Amino acid sequence: MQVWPILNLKKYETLSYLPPLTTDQLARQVDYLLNNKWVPCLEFETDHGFVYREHHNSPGYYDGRYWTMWKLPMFGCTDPAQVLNELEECKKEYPNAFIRIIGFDSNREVQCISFIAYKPAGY
Amino acid sequence: ASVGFKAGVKDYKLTYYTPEYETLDTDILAAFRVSPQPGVPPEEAGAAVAAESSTGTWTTVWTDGLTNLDRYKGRCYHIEPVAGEENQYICYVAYPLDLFEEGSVTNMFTSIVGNVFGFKALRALRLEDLRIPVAYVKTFQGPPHGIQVERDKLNKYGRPLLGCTIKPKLGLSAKNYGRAVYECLRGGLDFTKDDENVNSQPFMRWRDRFLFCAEALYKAQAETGEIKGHYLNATAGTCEDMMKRAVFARELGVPIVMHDYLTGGFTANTTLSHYCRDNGLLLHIHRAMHAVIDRQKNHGMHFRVLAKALRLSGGDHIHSGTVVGKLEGERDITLGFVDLLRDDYTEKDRSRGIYFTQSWVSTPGVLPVASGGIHVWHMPALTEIFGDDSVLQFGGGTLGHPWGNAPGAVANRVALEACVQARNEGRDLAREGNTIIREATKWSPELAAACEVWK
Amino acid sequence: ASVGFKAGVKDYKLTYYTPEYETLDTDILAAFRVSPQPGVPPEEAGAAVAAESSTGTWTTVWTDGLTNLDRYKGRCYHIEPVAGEENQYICYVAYPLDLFEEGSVTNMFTSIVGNVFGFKALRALRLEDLRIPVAYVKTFQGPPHGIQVERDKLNKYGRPLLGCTIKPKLGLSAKNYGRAVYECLRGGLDFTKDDENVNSQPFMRWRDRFLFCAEALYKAQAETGEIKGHYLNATAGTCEDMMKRAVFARELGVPIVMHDYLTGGFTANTTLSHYCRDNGLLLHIHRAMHAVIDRQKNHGMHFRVLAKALRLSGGDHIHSGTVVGKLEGERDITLGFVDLLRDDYTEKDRSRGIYFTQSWVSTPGVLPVASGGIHVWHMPALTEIFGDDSVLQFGGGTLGHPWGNAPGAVANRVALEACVQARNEGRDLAREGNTIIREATKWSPELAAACEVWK
Amino acid sequence: ASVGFKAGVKDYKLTYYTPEYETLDTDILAAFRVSPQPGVPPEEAGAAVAAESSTGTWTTVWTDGLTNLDRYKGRCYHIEPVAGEENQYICYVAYPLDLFEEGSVTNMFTSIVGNVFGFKALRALRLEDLRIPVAYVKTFQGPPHGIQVERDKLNKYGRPLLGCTIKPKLGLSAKNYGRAVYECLRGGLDFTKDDENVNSQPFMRWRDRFLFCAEALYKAQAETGEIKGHYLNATAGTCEDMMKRAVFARELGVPIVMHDYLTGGFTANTTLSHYCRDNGLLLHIHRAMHAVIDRQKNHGMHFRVLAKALRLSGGDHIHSGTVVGKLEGERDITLGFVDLLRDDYTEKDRSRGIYFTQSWVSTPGVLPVASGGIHVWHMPALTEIFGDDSVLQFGGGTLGHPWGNAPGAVANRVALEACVQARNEGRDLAREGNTIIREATKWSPELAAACEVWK
Amino acid sequence: ASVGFKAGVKDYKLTYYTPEYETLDTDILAAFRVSPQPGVPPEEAGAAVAAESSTGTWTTVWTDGLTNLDRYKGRCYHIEPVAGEENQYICYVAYPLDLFEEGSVTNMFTSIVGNVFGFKALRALRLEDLRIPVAYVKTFQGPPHGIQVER
Amino acid sequence: DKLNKYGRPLLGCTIKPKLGLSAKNYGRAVYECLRGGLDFTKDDENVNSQPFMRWRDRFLFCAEALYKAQAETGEIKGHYLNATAGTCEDMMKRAVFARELGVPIVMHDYLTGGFTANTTLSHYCRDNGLLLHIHRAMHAVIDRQKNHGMHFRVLAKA
Ligand SMILES: O=C(COP(=O)(O)O)[C@H](O)[C@H](O)COP(=O)(O)O
Ligand SMILES: O=C(COP(=O)(O)O)[C@H](O)[C@H](O)COP(=O)(O)O
Ligand SMILES: O=C(COP(=O)(O)O)[C@H](O)[C@H](O)COP(=O)(O)O
Ligand SMILES: [Ca+2]
Ligand SMILES: [Ca+2]
Ligand SMILES: [Ca+2]
Ligand SMILES: [Ca+2]
C-alpha cells in the first residue's frame, strides 16, 4: 500500500501523469495534431505554472490559465521537426520556463489540445 | 374548422391522416411507435394519434367555426410497418409552430405527449424522436455554457474528463464526505459528485455539505495545480430552496452545480439553467427516473427525446449510460443520441435510431457522462466509443481501490492518459486496449493494484 | 457498513432480503411489481430492488466503515407471487425515514424510483404503492385548501361541482375564448377551464386570456348570483414565468389557477402550491403525461402513487379519469385511489389495489375530477360512483350541445340536480338512472335536446 | 361534542378522566404534578387539568354540536400518588396531534400550559415532562447544527470544550472588554462569552463590542493555531434589532452568536435559529430567568421541559447548571435531562425524572454547558459527570487567576487535558481526581498557581 | 479564415462577390442601392459592401486562422442595374444567422448598417430592404398586442 | 489621473476578427496586445452577445487577460467591454458585471443603442467610477452627404 505523495506533485493536465515524453513520443504527439489538420503553437510561463486566484473569485474565474505565446501558431506547418526545433529555441531562451504545446482546430474554432513539453529543473 | 353546426359525434380518419402532406421547416415532427388494438387499421391509429395530440374532439363543437382549425391540427403524414413486430407501426406526425410556447419544454411535452398515451384504440405508444425546427430552437437558451466554453473555463484539453460519485450516498457526515472528496480529487480526477439522492437530509444538511466540499476541493486544487470541481446537488422541493442552494455555490466561487431534471422538473430546470448562465456556473444534469419512462420498447418515450429536451432547457453535462455490457445496435443507438447532444447537425440515420435530420443553429453541445459499473479495464473501450468530449465517472471504480481514493484516482487518470497517448500514436484501442493497460501497470503500482482487483 | 477492507465485488442477497424485518411506523414502504430476467430467483430480484434503490454498490468501498449502513439500507422484507403471471412478484421494500428530505416529493421520487428501473437483472418494474408514514406526511403542506375549505369558500354544497373545458384548445382568440367562457358559466356550470396545452402561444398570449376570462366570469357571476371560476393555466417554462401568471390571477381577485404538475414538475408545483395557500387561490391540477408512466401494468408507476405525491406537494383538484367505459376491477381500482385522495384514513385492500393502510393525520383531501367523453347520460353513473365530492367536467359534452354553450350548461346542471334529488329521495341511481333523466326531459327542453344528440 | 342543547353549567369528571385510554403514538403526553385543594379527589383534579388545558367550558355552549369534541379533548388517562407528599399526585394527560401548530413551540406551550395553572380547584401545579411524538418533532428544524456538526466545524475532538464569561458584565469599555477576550482565548480556552445582561448599553454599544471582540478572537486564533469563538449576544428588544446583530456577526465571519431564549422569547428564538442554520452560525443559548419558573417543586415547569422546547426551537448549546454542590438524585435528574438534550432516544426512567420514553428521529443533539462557581478542582468531576460532549465555562475561575487571564486559561486547559489523558489511560476520575490534578501541578506553574488559590 | 500568415494588405473582390451563392432560409438578406465612385466596377462595389459590413479587414491579420471566416462573412450574391440611373445598382447581400444577437434590433442595425455607409469607394448607399428569416423573427416579442387584440 | 498616463496620446487596438473567435482565444489576443505596450484593447462595435461568444464569457476572459498584462508591465490597462444590448435591462446587467470585475472601462454604441439608453449608462458610469468609450456606429448613414442629414459635429455635441 503506497501513499500518493503530497509535496512537489503539481501536474499540468493532459499527459502529465505519464512518464515524461521522449523526443520520439513528443514527435508522435505532434504528428497527431498535423494529421488532424490542427495548428500547433507553443506557450511558456516563467512565474506560476499552475492555476491560482488573485484578481477575482467568482465562478469560472481563475488566474494562471493563460501563458504567453512563443511566436505565432504554426500555420501550414507540415513537419513535426519544425515544431520541435522551436521547442529547442524556446528552451534555449527560457530554460527556467514551463513550455507546453497546444493546438488549434480552426474548424471547431477552438484551442483543442494542450500538453506539457518541458518543465524546468526540479519539477 | 368552420361550420353549419348540427351537433353530434362524427369520425376522425379523413382529417388527420394526410399522406400527401409536405412538412414545413417550421413544423415540429414526431415519430411515434404505435401498437394499435386488434381491429384498428394503421391509418386509423395514425389519425387517432394526430387528432388526440391536437384538435380532435369526441363530439362536434360550434366554436370550431370561429377559427381555421386546419392551421392548428396535428397531421399524420406517413406510416411505415415495424419489422419483426406484428401490428406495430411508426407514424409520423407534424405539429404547426404556432401550437407551442416559446422557450417552454414544459409546453412542448404537454402538447405532444400530454394526452395521447391513454387513448383506448391503442394498446401501447412510444415517442421515438422529435424534429425540433430551428425557429423553435432559437427561442431557447440551450446549455448555460456547453462543451467548448467548459473546456476553456477549466483549461482541460485532449482527453475525456474524469469524475467519481461519493459513496455511500447516505450515511456519511458532511465532514467525512468532504474528506472522501479531497482524497479523490488530489489523485487526478477532475470532479467529484453528489449522488442524485443527496439533497438535504437529517444526517447531512446541504449547507454543511457544500461548505466542507468547498474546503476539500480548494485543498485538492492547491495541491495538484489542476482545476477541480464537485457537482453540488441543488435539487430541492421548491424553486425557492433550489435557488438558495445555487446562490450559496455562487458565493463559494465554485464552478459547478447539479440538478435531477426529471424529478425536479423542466420548469425548475429552466430556471436553474438561466441562473447558471447569468452567474457562470456549469450545470451537471442527472437523469434519475429516466428508466421509468424510456426502458420499455413499446411504451413511454425513448431517451433521445429526453436528451433533446435537456439540450433545449439547458445543461452542460448529461448522463448517457455506458455502452459497456450491451450488444451493437444498443451501442449504435447510444452513439446516435450522443451525436444529437454534441453536434450542430445530425443527418437522419435509422440504423442509429435517428428518425429526423436535426439542426441546432449553433446551440452549444452537451457533454455526455458515462457512468455505471465501470473500472480501469473499460478505459480503452470508453475512450474509443465516446472520444474526448465525454465525462467518465467512477464511483465504486475509485472508492473501491485497495489503497484508497487517491491511488484509486491515480489509477484511473493514468489508465485514461495511457489510452489517449496510445490512440494519438496511432494504436488501435479496440484491438490493443488490454495491452495498452498492461504496459502502464509496469510503471504504475497504483494502476497495477487496480488491475489485480477488477476483471 | 464497517470494514476490514480488502477491495472487490461481493454479493447482495444476504443483506437486502430481510424476510424477518418488522417495519417501523416511520418507514416509507414500497410495493414493487417485479418481473425478473429468466434465471433470477425472486429473493435475488427483491434484494436487487432494495440494494439498487438505496446503498447497494457494485464493488466494496472503504468509506462504508465510517458509518452504520444498516441504518440506511432499503430492505426487501416480503415477496409474494402475482397470480396469473409467470415469473412476476410483488416485493415489499422498507426505507428509513432518514433517507428523505422533509417536504420534498422531488427527493422522495429520486430516492425510490431514481435508479432501480434500469437494473439489468429485471425485465420490467412497476411501483404500485407507497406507504407514507405520518411523520413524513407532517413535513408537507398538502393541499392549499382542500375539499372542506373549497366548498366553504364557494358556498356550494350537496352535489358534484361542474366544469367545462373550452375547445378548440388552440385557435380561438382571447376574446372569443372569453365569450365561450361566459356562455358556459351563465348556464349553470361552476367552472370553465383552460386546456392543459393552453399556456401562452402566438394567437393567444396568457395575459390577454386571463383578462378576458375575468370579464366573462364576473359577468356570468353577476347574472346568475352563483360563484364562478375559470381554471387559469399558470404552467410555464420557468418558475419566474409561472409566478408572474399566478400573481396576475391574484390581482384580478379570481378564485382558481391551474398547473400541469408532471410536465411542469414537482419542484415548481410545490412552489405554486405554497403561493396559492399564502394567497387564497384554489389550485386545479391537470395530470398531462401520466399515461406515459402509468399505463402499462408491467412497467412504470401506477397512478395511485402519482396521486399521493400530488396530495403531499399540493393541489385542490386532480384529474382521476372517468370510471365509465371500463369493467369492474378497473372501476374498483379508481374508487380505491379516490379514497386515497379524499379520506383521512384508508385501510389496506388488495381488491382495490391498496397495498398499504394509509393515514393522513388531517392533511386535507383532494377533489377528484372526472373528465373524458362524458355527457348527460353518464350523470346517474358518475353521481353514484363519485358521490358529491367530485368535479364532473364536460368539454364536448357542453360545447357540443345543438343550441350552444348556455343551454349545454343548463342541460348538464339540470341532469345533475335531477340525479341528486332522486338519490336523496332514496331512488336507485344504478337501476333508475335512465328513467330519472327521461323524466327531467319532460320539463327541460335543454335537457331533452341534449338527450336526443347523445347515446 | 353534539347536542340537544338546553343551556346550563354541567360537570367535567366523566368526560376527561379516561383511565382506560390507550395513548396514540401521535399524542403529546404531559406529566403534571398536581396538588389539589382540600376536598378535591384525585380523579376530579386530573379531570380538571385535562378539561382546563383543552375543551372544558364552564357552561354548555351550542356550538359543540357542530364538531366532534372527543377528537379534540385532552384526556387524563392515569394518576399515581406522589410518595412522601400528602394530597399530591402525578396525572398523565394526552393531547391529540391536531391541537398544535406545526413548528411552533409558542403554540405548544400556549395550549398545554397557557391556562391550567390558575385553576382554583388546584393549590399548585407543575409540568414535569412532555412526550413529544415523532410526527410533531418532524415539523421543527431543531438545532441549527448540533453536536456532531459543531465539532466538525471547529475541528475539536475528544474532550469537553472550554469557555469563560467576561466579567465584570457591565462597566468595561468595548476595547477593554476585547482585551480580556484576547488574553483568555490565547491561553487555551475555545470560547469567551458575553454575559446574559450584555446586549447594548450606554457604556458599551453592541456594534463596538462585536468589532473589538472580532479583533481579539482573530488575534488569539492566529497566535495559537486553534479555532476560537466568542458568544456575541444578539438578544434585543425587537426582532429587527436581534436580526441586525446576527447579520453583523455574519459579516465579520465569526462562528457563534448567543440568545437569551426565555427573556427574548420562543418566537424570536425560532427566527434566530432559522437564520443561524441558513448562515452557518452556531447558536449558544443562555437560560436567564429559568429559576423563576423551574425552581419550586410544587409549581412551575421543570427545566427538562424547557430543555426539550429549546431542542425543538433550536440551539447548539444550552446551559444545564453544574452537578457540583448537590446531592445524588439532583445529580441524577441533571444527567437525565442531559440525555434528553444529547441523545436520539431516551427510555422512561423515573429514577432520573424521565416520565416518558422520548425519540428524536435524528434531530441533532444539543451540547450542555456547565457553568457556575467552578474552578480547576472540579475538573475531574465535571469530566466524569458530563463526558466529552459538554462545554465547561469558567468566569471567575479564569479571570480570578493570580497571574491573569492567559495563565488562568492555561491552568484550565491543562487541568482538563490531564483528566482526559488519565481517563483514557483507564484511571478512575471519581477516585483519583485530586491526584491527577496534583501530578499536573508538578509540571504546570500556571496550574499550581491556580490550585493554591482555590479549595 | 486560416493561414500561412505573411502580413500585408491583399484584395476583397474574390471572397465577397459570390454570384453562385444559394441563400439559406436562416440568412438575413439585404438589398442595398449602391452608387459607386467613378471607376469602381459593380462587382467590386458589391464585394466592398459585403466585406465592409462583415469580415473585411484592410490588412491581413493572423487571428483569421483560428476560425473559419467563411462561416461568418457577408456575401454579395447578386447585382442588378437600376433603370434610369447611371452607375447605380441593387446589390443583394446575405448575412449568416450567427452574426446577430437574439432579440436585438440594436445589434441587427449595428451589424448591417453600422459601418458601410462611410466607405470611400462608394459615392452613396441606401438600404432598401431586409429579409428577416423566421428563425430570427422568433427571437423577438413583436407588438405588445397587435391589430386583432387591440380591436 | 485615474490611469496615471501623461504627456502622450493613449493607444488602443480593436480585436479582430470581430466575430468567430471563442471568448478564450479572444482573451489571448487581448493579453498579447496589452503586454506589448498598448493601454487599451477593444470589442468591435458588433460584438455584444452572440452564439459563438456570449458576453459574460468574453468579459470574464478579457478580465483575466488584462490583469495578467497589467501585472506583467506595471502599467494600468483596460479593455472596452461592449455593453450595447437590446434592452435597457440587458445593457445594465453588462455594466454591472464590469463593475463586479473591478475593470476600468465599458463601451456603448450610442446611435444604435440610442440616446435614452446612453444617458442611463452615462449616469451609471459616473456613479460607479467607470470610464465610458463611445462608438459612433451608423453615423455615416446620417452625416455623410453634404446636402442632407446632420453633420457629425452636431452628433458630437449631443
Ligand atoms: O451512482 C452512480 C454510479 O456509481 P458506480 O460508478 O459506482 O457505478 C450513477 O448515478 C448511475 O450509474 C447513473 O444511472 P444512469 O446512467 O442510468 O443515469
Ligand atoms: O380535454 C379533456 C376532455 O375533453 P372532453 O370533456 O370533451 O372529453 C381532458 O383534459 C382529458 O379528458 C383529461 O385526460 P386524463 O383524464 O387522462 O387526465
Ligand atoms: O455568569 C455566569 C457564571 O460565572 P462564574 O463562571 O464566574 O460562576 C453564568 O451565566 C451563570 O452561572 C449561569 O446560570 P444558570 O447555570 O443557572 O443558567
Ligand atoms: Ca448515483
Ligand atoms: Ca384537455
Ligand atoms: Ca452570567
Ligand atoms: Ca470596428
Expressed in angstroms and rounded, the spacing between residue D233 Cα and the centre of ligand 3 is 15
Q: Among D314, D21, D305, D317, which residue's Cα sits nearest to residue D151? A: D317
Q: Do B373 and C203 touch (CB under 8 A)?
A: no
Given CA atoms B264, B265, B271, B276 in this order, what sign does their dihedral have? Answer: positive
Per 3-state DSSP, chain D is made up of helix, strand and coil in percentages (nearest 5) of 45, 15, 40
CA distance D371 to D287: 11
Name every residue whose Cβ is closer than 8 Å to that of residue D118 and which is 6 or more positions away in sequence: none
Q: Give, for ligand 2, the residue of B115, B119, B122 to mutate: max count of ligand atoms closer than 8 Å to Cβ.
A: B115
Expressed in angstroms and rounded, the spacing between residue F40 Cα and the centre of ligand 7 is 14
Tell me the three cell numbers of residue D421: 489523558
Give F-chain residues touching A104 at CB under 8 angstroms.
25
Q: Among A62, A67, A61, which residue's Cα sits nearest to residue A51? A: A62
**B373 in contact with ligand 1, CB cutoff 6 A:** yes
CA distance A101 to A28: 13
What is the residue type of B264? Answer: G
Residue the block writes with cell 388517562? D77
The count of C-alpha atoms lying within 13 angstroms of the C-alpha of B422, restricted to the half-sphere facing its C-beta, is: 25
The residues that bridge with B270 in the sheet, in sequence order, are none
CA distance A16 to A101: 12
Dihedral angle, C-alpha C299, C303, C308, C310, nearest 10 °: 110
**B321 in contact with ligand 1, CB cutoff 6 A:** yes
Phi and psi, residue D29, nearest 5° = -105, 140
Residues in chain C: 455
Q: Among B201, B196, B202, B204, which residue's Cα sits nearest to residue B234? A: B196
Is E115 annotated as belonging to a binding site? yes
* Shortest Cα distance, chain D CAs vs residue B175, angstroms: 6
Ligand 3 is surrounded, with C-beta below 6 A, by: D 165, 195-196, 287, 319, 321, 371-373, 393-397
If phi over 0 gives left and psi between -120 and 50 gives alpha, with beta otherwise, what is residue B4? left
Exposed/middle/buried for residue E107 (C-beta within 10 Å: 0-12, 13-18, 19+): buried
Write the DSSP string, D382-450.
HHHHH-SS-EEE-SHHHHTSTT-HHHHHHHHHHHHHHHHHHHHTT--HHHHHHHHHHHHHTT-HHHHHH
Do A and C make contact, counting contact as 3+ CB pairs within 8 angstroms?
A: no
Given CA atoms B135, B141, B147, B151 in this order, what sign does their dihedral have? Answer: positive
Q: Among F134, F26, F25, F5, which residue's Cα sits nearest to residue F77? A: F5
User: How is residue C65 annotated by DSSP?
Assistant: G
CA distance C40 to E94: 64
User: Are the beta carbons of A12 and A49 closer than 8 angstroms?
Assistant: yes
* Shortest Cα distance, chain E CAs vs residue C213, angstroms: 14
* Shortest Cα distance, chain E CAs vs residue F134, angstroms: 13
What is the residue type of C310? Answer: L
CA distance F52 to F21: 8
Exposed/middle/buried for residue C196 (C-beta within 10 Å: 0-12, 13-18, 19+): buried
Q: Give, for ligand 3, the residue of D375, D393, D412 to mutate: max count of ligand atoms closer than 8 Å to Cβ.
A: D393
Calculate helix-pair angle for A23-35, B405-424, nearest 10 degrees: 60
- Three-state DSSP at C436 gives helix
* Shortest Cα distance, chain C CAs vs residue B300, angstroms: 5
The residues that bridge with E79 in the sheet, in sequence order, are E91
Distances (CA, A) of B171 to B65, B350, D86: 63, 46, 52
CA distance B74 to B71: 9
Residue B42: asked if its preceding bond is cis (omega within 30°), the reply is: no
CA distance E54 to C441: 76
Expressed in angstroms and rounded, the spacing between residue D196 Cα and the centre of ligand 6 is 5
Exposed/middle/buried for residue F146 (C-beta within 10 Å: 0-12, 13-18, 19+): exposed
Specified resolution (Å): 2.2
The count of C-alpha atoms lying within 13 angstroms of the C-alpha of D45, restricted to the half-sphere facing its C-beta, is: 28
What Rg, from alpha-carbon coordinates, does chain B have?
Answer: 24
Q: Considering CB atoms only, which of F24, F56, F93 is closest to B152? A: F24
How many CB pairs below 8 Å do chains C and E form together? 7
CA distance D22 to D194: 48
Expressed in angstroms and rounded, the spacing between residue D184 Cα and the centre of ligand 3 is 17
CA distance B102 to B113: 17
- Using alpha carbons only, what angle is made at residue E26 by residues B21 and B351, rounded to the nearest 5 degrees? 55
Tell me the three cell numbers of residue B140: 431557447
Domain boundaries of chain A, sorted by first residue? 1-123
User: Are the beta carbons of C236 and B211 closer than 8 angstroms?
Assistant: no
CA distance B150 to B388: 13
The residues that bridge with B17 in the sheet, in sequence order, are B76
Q: Name chain B's partners: 3 or more CB pairs within 8 A.
A: A, C, D, E, F
**B320 in contact with ligand 1, CB cutoff 6 A:** no
User: Are the beta carbons of D263 and D290 closer than 8 angstroms?
Assistant: no
Phi and psi, residue D10, nearest 5° = 80, 180
Expressed in angstroms and rounded, the spacing between residue B195 Cα and the centre of ligand 4 is 4
Give B-chain residues touching F22 at CB under 8 angstroms.
148-149, 152
Starting at the edge strand found earlier in the chain, the sheet holding B28-36 runs B75-81, B89-95, B28-36, B122-131, B300-301
CA distance C186 to C405: 9
CA distance E34 to C97: 76
The 8 Å CB, 24+ separation contacts for A74-80 are A74/A39, A74/A40, A74/A41, A75/A39, A75/E2, A75/E3, A75/E4, A75/E5, A75/E62, A75/E65, A76/E3, A76/E4, A77/A34, A77/A39, A77/A40, A78/A34, A79/A34, A80/A27, A80/A30, A80/A31, A80/A34
User: Are the beta carbons of D226 and D217 closer than 8 angstroms?
Assistant: no
CA distance B54 to C171: 11
Give E-chain residues touching B139 at CB under 8 angstroms.
138-139
Give E-chain residues touching B136 at CB under 8 angstroms.
138
| C32 membership: H or E segment, kind and range | strand C28-36
* Shortest Cα distance, chain A CAs vs residue F30, angstroms: 11
- Find the ligand nearest to D195 CA: 6
Question: Is C13 among the catalytic positions?
Answer: no
- Find the ligand nearest to D372 CA: 3
Ion ligand 6: residues, CB < 5 A: D 195
Residue the block writes with cell 457577408? E74
Residue the block writes with cell 438578406? E29
Q: Among A60, F98, E136, which residue's Cα sits nearest to residue B316? A: A60
Exposed/middle/buried for residue C21 (C-beta within 10 Å: 0-12, 13-18, 19+): middle
Q: Do A1 and B253 touch (CB under 8 A)?
A: no
Q: Nearest chain A Cα to B190, which residue?
A: A13
Do C and B make contact, counting contact as 3+ CB pairs within 8 angstroms?
A: yes
CA distance B446 to B408: 7
- Three-state DSSP at E38 gives coil
Distances (CA, A) of E138 to A24, B26, B344, B364, F127: 55, 11, 19, 19, 37
CA distance B214 to B232: 10
Q: Do F114 and E106 touch (CB under 8 A)?
A: yes
Phi and psi, residue C63, nearest 5° = -65, -20
Neighbours of C120 (CB within 10 A): 11
Per-residue HEC secondary structure of chain B comes to CCCCCCCCCCCCCCCCECCCCCCCCCCEEEEEEEEECCCCCHHHHHHHHHHHCCCCCCCCCHHHHHCCHHHCCCEEEEEEECCCCCCCEEEEEEECHHHCCCCCHHHHHHHHHCCHHHCCCEEEEEEEEEECCHHHHCCCCCCCCCHHHHHHHHCCCCCCEEEEECCCCCCCCHHHHHHHHHHHHHCCCCEEECCCCCCCECCECHHHHHHHHHHHHHHHHHHHCCCCEEEEECCCCCHHHHHHHHHHHHHHCCCEEEEEHHHHCHHHHHHHHHHHHHHCCEEEEECCCHHHHHCCCCCEECHHHHHHHHHHHCCCEEECCCCCCCCCCHHHHHHHHHHHHHCCEECCEHHHCECCCEECCCCCCCEEEEECCCCHHHHHHHHHHHCCCCEEECCHHHHCCCCCHHHHHHHHHHHHHHHHHHHHCCCCHHHHHHHHHHHHHCCCHHHHHHHHHCC
Q: Considering CB atoms only, which of B203, B208, B244 is closest to D362? A: B203
CA distance F81 to F62: 8
Q: Among F12, F20, F94, which residue's Cα sits nearest to residue F59? A: F94
CATH architecture designation of domain A1-123: 2-Layer Sandwich (3.30)
Phi and psi, residue C138, nearest 5° = -65, -10
Tell me the three cell numbers of residue B79: 406510416
* Shortest Cα distance, chain E CAs vs residue A77, angstroms: 8
- Among protein residues, the one whose CA lies closest to atom 3 of ligand 1: B372
How many CB pairs below 8 Å do chains B and C form together? 336
End-to-end CA separation in angstroms for chain E? 53
Beta-strand relationship, F12-14 and F40-42: parallel
CA distance C406 to C186: 6
CA distance C97 to C361: 17
Residues in chain F: 158
Q: Among E40, E41, E69, which residue's Cα sits nearest to residue E56? A: E69
User: How is residue C240 annotated by DSSP?
Assistant: H
CA distance F114 to F106: 16
What Rg, from alpha-carbon coordinates, does chain F have?
Answer: 16
Residues in chain D: 455
Tell me the three cell numbers of residue B27: 413544423
Do C and F make contact, counting contact as 3+ CB pairs within 8 angstroms?
A: no
- Find the ligand nearest to D392 CA: 3
- Encode C289-325: b = buried (16+ Cβ within 10 Å), e = exposed: bbbbbbbbeebbbbbbbbbbbbbbbbbbbbbbbbbee
The 8 Å CB, 24+ separation contacts for D392-395 are D392/D160, D392/D161, D392/D162, D392/D163, D392/D416, D393/D162, D393/D163, D393/D164, D393/D165, D393/D193, D393/D369, D394/D162, D394/D163, D394/D164, D394/D189, D395/D164, D395/D165, D395/D166, D395/D167, D395/D371
Give B-chain residues touching E139 at CB under 8 angstroms.
138-139
Set out the domains of chain D in order of their start, with CATH numbers.
14-140 (3.30.70.150), 141-454 (3.20.20.110)
**B395 in contact with ligand 1, CB cutoff 6 A:** yes
Give B-chain residues touching A30 at CB under 8 angstroms.
none
Q: Nearest chain E Cα to B25, which residue?
A: E25
- Three-state DSSP at F84 gives coil
- Among protein residues, the one whose CA lies closest to atom 6 of ligand 2: C395
CA distance D236 to D233: 9
- Three-state DSSP at C227 gives coil
User: Are the beta carbons of A41 and A74 closer than 8 angstroms?
Assistant: yes
> Please, where are the H alpha helices in F74-146?
88-101, 110-113, 115-128, 139-143
What is the residue type of E144? Answer: P
CA distance A31 to A38: 10
**B394 in contact with ligand 1, CB cutoff 6 A:** yes
Neighbours of C161 (CB within 10 A): 22
Calculate helix-pair angle for C266-279, C303-313, nearest 10 degrees: 40
CA distance B72 to B50: 11
Binding residues of B for substrate are: 57, 115, 165, 169, 196, 286-287, 319, 326, 371, 373, 395-396
Residue C168: asked if its preceding bond is cis (omega within 30°), the reply is: yes
Residue the block writes with cell 421515438? B128
End-to-end CA separation in angstroms for chain D? 65
Q: Do F22 and B280 touch (CB under 8 A)?
A: no
CA distance D228 to D255: 8
- Among protein residues, the one whose CA lies closest to atom 16 of ligand 3: D321
Residues in chain E: 151
Q: Name chain A's partners: 3 or more CB pairs within 8 A.
A: B, E, F
Write the DSSP string, D262-320.
HHH-HHHHHHHHHHHHHHT-EEEEE-TTHHHHHS-SSSEE-HHHHHHHHHHH--SEEE-
Q: Do B414 and A18 touch (CB under 8 A)?
A: yes
- Among protein residues, the one whose CA lies closest to atom 4 of ligand 1: B395
> Please, where are the H alpha helices in C316-366?
330-342
What Rg, from alpha-carbon coordinates, does chain D have?
Answer: 24
Neighbours of D340 (CB within 10 A): 24
Q: Do E98 and B362 touch (CB under 8 A)?
A: yes
User: Are the beta carbons of F141 and E113 closer than 8 angstroms?
Assistant: yes
Expressed in angstroms and rounded, the spacing between residue D33 Cα and the centre of ligand 1 is 57
Q: What are the counts of helices (DSSP H) followed by strands (DSSP E) for chain F?
A: 7, 5
